Amino acid sequence: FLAXP
């Protein structure tokens, strides 16, 4: 599971 930050 979030990618990016």
Place this chain on the structure above:
Amino acid sequence: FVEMVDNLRGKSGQGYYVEMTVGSPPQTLNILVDTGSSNFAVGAAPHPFLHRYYQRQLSSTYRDLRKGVYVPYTQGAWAGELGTDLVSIPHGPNVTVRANIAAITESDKFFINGSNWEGILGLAYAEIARPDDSLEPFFDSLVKQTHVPNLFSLQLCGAASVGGSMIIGGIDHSLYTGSLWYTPIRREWYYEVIIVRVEINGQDLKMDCKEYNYDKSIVDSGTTNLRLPKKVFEAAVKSIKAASSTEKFPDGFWLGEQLVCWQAGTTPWNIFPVISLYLMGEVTNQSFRITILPQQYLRPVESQDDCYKFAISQSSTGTVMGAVIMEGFYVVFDRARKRIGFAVSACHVHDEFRTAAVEGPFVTLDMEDCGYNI
């Protein structure tokens, strides 16, 4: 909480899910529990891998926010339509809330064939919700609309059936033994923590502790592996290799491309080392450690053989303490007190000689310096 015990199910290596209902009348769906993101989203259109899906047109309470959303993950991604509806957790608190729901209409490498879940509950903070922090995450909405305290805890029970408990609003002591040790949440976005030391079978990995948290370290129920920053991954593999002297494994095994197999019942766990992560404590110069077994990091893959995949892997975006770590522990996400608690899980997989462990205190100076900045 007795009504919440064993409310998690799953297929080994395919994810832990809780049953929820959405819409009116209630549409029952299985939802992956994911502390590594902040969006609540459900399959909302037919897909080869879905047994069921959210039918918005059949819910009288559905609201269309008329805006799209895209969510990328380390593994997979999906896009969909934003909206809101009424949401309940059958085996959780007895309440119905209005919440934001992304109806997934397109996806890539996200849903998992045979996993028996149809959606995902992002349990992390608003700061990383998509499209932006104004899209209130589910658990924030739950807390605002009810008297559920601002805390949940997870007990993930490994193995081909898997299970466990998500206790919403509290801590169930029958789920752990020994003491709960708390580490601060460094920043409210992911559940970010700070690792201050690493040992393999008691041997210090001897890296600058900033390496362990480059560029962040997070606790993530929705990721299988213990993922380590590239530099730390390489050092860990070398140390694990050295420790497991009596046996040589191919490079492909350490990259997760080859399984290791033994005659059923003869797995030589003793060959592999335990692995300890020391975490920043709540008190100055005080740390504690959590220790996992190879039964955690060698994950069984499904004859008369037991086959395993090495489930420690490299990361380009910091450490991820995934199921590999969480399966050893009862983990308390204490949002109210901005801290994460760890205790030995009453259900963790182990053997007659070694056990997952949580111990302290240990003395560690300048722990705050172990954080990476930005």
